[PDB]
């Protein structure tokens, strides 16, 4: 029931696998250490092994053995006869810095109850002292445990450990001389320049009132990277089904309506662009939809890192209408129901590396406001997606309100906020007939 | 031989100059607590005396005795004879004082044992748990003794005693005849004049609206602070990593855009000034910081405590994004948990006597106002930031809003609380592609 | 463990208390009875002492054996030399009336036990009796004894002896002739007419935004009661330490601007000012600050209770900012933790009979009204401090928000509540640079 | 639960005796007044203890749990003229 809390069997797992592997003694040398360890014959093996991977690399069963035996210790340290069950166990594989970990873990835990002994003993044990030079005795000794348990990188670093990162960041883009696209490209030239493409650990938003294009805007840019990216993405449409989506996209990348599709009256040139664009989908296999009604961060989590690790790793998520997202347990309150998701898509897009289209909506403000530019403020629920959001770029186009509009043909997209990079007005022509989005060769902004 | 300490003869020396004297139980109860005592009948015939001294002055004797059987506790605490003995017992002087004294300071180490078995045996007892979250509970329970004891030099001073150190403190100003500035230099002329520097207990705030420059601003705070001192500041940056700020910061110092950095394409007068920059920060050592996302004010509280004591003693604090900060025993009002949040930075800020920036965001309650230049009232949460604080100073970028605009470029910090000071509406230009702000050697404001 | 009630230690002390005592008898008569007593011995010697303080006025010794000789009842209660045995011993102090009231009331619980014994007694034995003769018989039992009540100083109290309470108070005021301020006095002649100074008792609550000048008003309040009243004044400096609120009183008494006192950059004129306010208040020694921060109302009472014991007997109590005052009992629910604090700082007022000045906040209310001349309802928390109070007083000075105001220097104190007097709005002069409220010559308000 | 109350040959021991028709209201009436006399012991023994070991407290709460069992009691049995009554009746009041 009581005693030292150690595991001694997944150590002479670690000894025979570091025997077995004479590669891996560096990584779990960043872990492992030689008082790390339990009982002294362990301690003697593995600070043996030690010094020998400083000079003496091979070392699985006799090298062992004649080191230790050079300077008078077999059967002293247990014995080669015993050691033989080290190296008959544990032909396990790659599976070894978890013990590592865990019996680091163990260590730690071991030196605890070590230092509450230590304690209770000075506190029993009076010495002639007082509480205050007891107590900050105790604080001393439990603020160097805590400062220094052989952790570097959950902890407050120092400039230079930075500056590496930073360096090391510039050296990969500098090493590679490229055009002005940090990240995913969208396919409009006009957008890459205020943004860089988009950057792969952001939450993108692409808001705007319904039957603006907001949905179309967000498939053209994932059909057109998907197009461009050897890479996966993702889709959920969490509003309309998968049969809808197809459908616009083929009327998107082969310039048909959908009328034309949908009922069957097109003709030879439109066949053949369909046939094509199919058999270009088919080829790069990227596009992977759910069309799943009311999902959680959970199961978007899980769903995304299916794929990031079968499939290889992605480029992109898309995410329609999140407000549909859910949280049961804040369910009641939707504003931070609405917070929760937000931060769950940003910490997916810090996990995976990649960026998070998130579509969203607007209120019913703007109407009495006689200019309709949507603002920042001009977010469905909670204000917190204008917090998390790495960049926002709304949609507006006159039409829909000015019938007397001569930017007709045209939706400009709002960059309304972007946290590393300028704010602006892109421009570009609409033509739902065959949802999409396209260049616009014109006037500057 | 190893028995828990508890020096009893002053304990009954104690009750007993009690019992004859009402006068000095105040003075001993400053220090006298039921928890503190050994033995149970002596808790409760002291946490009744205590209840007649709140209610009955007059009791020697026999007055005790009686409340004791106002309902039935006889001879549960001893007996009637053993209650007179006592009475009848220590004729001793007035050294009640130091009795007390030793009376109150051994329970504490009785505590401390105490807690100390209760860390051992539970991590004998692991209970689903790992190292990094029973370090955790050590750390709590131990200052948590720590600080509920470390104030016992409190009560109401006379005023001779307060003068004497407040007159030292003018002094030691005196005592180094300098520039107007009583604390931290942030590099702004226009802004140390209303403010003689960050002052070194307090809390300051930084808040605007998401794209309106205060990360920006209090890096920008911490970058010049590091250049002024030769002392240790941190950063906690709770809303995206390093490798964004110290690539945002390098341009903020050495005015090389930020699309120039990450994209390579900057050129020899620009590589030179990054080297520069480079050079000097890593011949100085200031700057630590924290790319943890929710963390709670404990994990601050400690990940400050050690850069303490390790470098000198640390000179200011930055906490990005406050609301993100966690504790999760009022996870469901938000209200108190920023309650707590700020309270708590603001003990921070007085234990280790340095500045804390705070940074915060603000409602959209501005937005539907026409004037939106930011209030006190605006505070993201709780309105105790409002109250909590020494010196808020919002942002004001009004090109963000009107498109048309002659206060493009500029950028004011509408300060809008302070204590110790006057409020004003600083003026200060803006330049986001290398993410800066500056002075505006410029017409009146 | 189980045995009939009775004290006796209790009783030969109260005895002997009398026969060491002609002087003070009609105190313990007023309490204790003949039949109040166990044994009736001293049931003679009780009521024997009695008839001769009405008759024979020195009974110590031998005027009561003398007595108790002249009916004849010489060893029947006892003996001469058990009687000098009993004036001998107990030379208690003046707790006597103690022990008389507990006597007292152990006579009504051994009446209590008899009683219940009485109703057992009906109960066994039934005599062939009805319930409607049984139930009401035993109840008007408990009540015909509870028509003793000897405890005649509580709800049966005749309106004559209410106004001659009062009268005695207006005796206190008209023997007295003196200007129209029957209470503390502030130094502002314009507040002491809608005031009538600050009275005793009274809970007084000060209330504004956080820099609205609450804690200015309040020491400037607490530090003219100091200049004009030789009487003490505490100071539960919650919010800020002794080191800020001093140097901000030194320059409020001595008008210099609190920037060039800590800076140092002061001239002759002004040192002048600071050594005569210094010589003055350390020449009445009069002024007490406690800078604790999570006080309880038990500390706060126990604080003040000191200083109402060794320096005489105190004036005025300033609480800056209550909420910070904590019961942790009642951590969950905050209003009624605030309840109980205003209800504790009410009771401590009417305790000592003096003033009570708790500074309070405001909800963020005012500023979704566009009057922002703060209300009652304008607290904030729980609404007992808008019940609970005597008076409070807001404060508005207008130029925080309306910066094109006709009102700058001029903060008008906004009684909003007064049980014993009107509300209004006192004009003043708001001189913050030196940290002063003044009076105001100005036009008819 | 059989036997556990006694027994069915009991049972029918008490099904078989008291043949009685005429009065049965008034023998519960005087069962019913013995369990009240019996109840009153009870309170009575209940003051007696808490009067000998009640176990904390000061005793000006004392005499009104004393005062306030006695009129809860009261409140508790008194009231046994209520009944639903007569109009014939109740205008007589109104
Ligand atoms: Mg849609
Ligand atoms: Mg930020
Ligand atoms: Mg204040």
Same mark, same amino acid.
């Given at each position: 029931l009581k005693v030292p809390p150690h595991s001694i069997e997944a150590e002479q797992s670690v000894l025979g696998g570091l025997m077995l592997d004479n590669e891996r003694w560096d990584d779990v040398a960043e872990r492992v250490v030689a008082d790390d360890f339990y009982t002294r014959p362990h301690r003697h093996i593995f600070t043996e092994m030690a010094r020998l991977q400083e000079s003496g690399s091979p070392i699985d069963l006799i090298t062992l053995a004649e080191s230790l035996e050079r300077q008078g210790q077999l059967d002293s340290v247990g014995g080669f006869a015993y050691l033989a069950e080290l190296s008959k166990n544990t032909p396990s594989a790659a599976n070894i810095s978890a013990y590592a970990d865990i019996v680091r873990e163990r260590a730690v835990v071991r030196e605890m109850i070590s230092v509450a002994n230590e304690i209770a003993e000075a506190g029993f044990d009076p010495q002639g002292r007082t509480s205050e030079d007891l107590l900050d005795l105790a604080e001393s000794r439990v603020f160097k445990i805590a400062e220094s348990?052989?952790?570097?990188?959950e902890g407050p670093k120092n400039i230079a450990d930075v500056l590496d990162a930073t360096v090391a960041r510039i050296e990969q883009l500098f090493q590679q001389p490229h055009d002005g696209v940090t990240g995913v490209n969208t396919g409009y030239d006009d957008l890459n320049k205020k943004?860089?493409?988009? !950057?792969?650990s952001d939450l993108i938003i692409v808001a705007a009132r319904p039957s603006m294009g907001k949905t179309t805007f967000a498939m053209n840019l994932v059909e057109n990277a998907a197009m461009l990216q050897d890479k996966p993405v993702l889709i959920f449409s969490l509003e309309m089904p998968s049969e809808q989506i197809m459908m616009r996209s083929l009327a998107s990348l082969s310039r048909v309506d959908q009328t034309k599709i949908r009922t069957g009256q097109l003709d030879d040139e439109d066949w053949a662009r369909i046939s094509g664009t199919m058999g270009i989908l088919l080829e790069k296999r990227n596009i992977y939809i759910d069309d799943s009604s009311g999902l959680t961060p959970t199961e978007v989590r899980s769903r995304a890192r299916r794929i990031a690790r079968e499939h290889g790793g992605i480029g992109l998520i898309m995410i329609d209408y999140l407000q549909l997202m859910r949280v049961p347990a804040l369910s009641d309150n939707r504003t931070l129901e609405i917070a929760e998701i937000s931060r769950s898509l940003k910490a997916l897009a810090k996990e995976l590396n990649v960026p998070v289209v998130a579509l969203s909506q607007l209120n019913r403000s703007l109407e009495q406001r006689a200019d309709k530019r949507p603002v920042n403020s001009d977010l469905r629920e909670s204000g917190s997606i204008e917090q998390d959001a790495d960049l926002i770029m709304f949609i507006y186009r006159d039409e829909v309100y000015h019938e007397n509009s001569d930017l007709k043909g045209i939706a400009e997209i709002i960059i309304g906020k972007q946290r590393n990079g300028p704010i602006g007005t892109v421009r570009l022509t609409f033509?739902? !007939?065959?949802s999409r989005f396209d260049n616009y060769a014109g006037p500057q902004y």
């Open positions: 348990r052989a952790n570097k990188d943004t860089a493409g988009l !950057q792969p033509n739902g !007939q065959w």
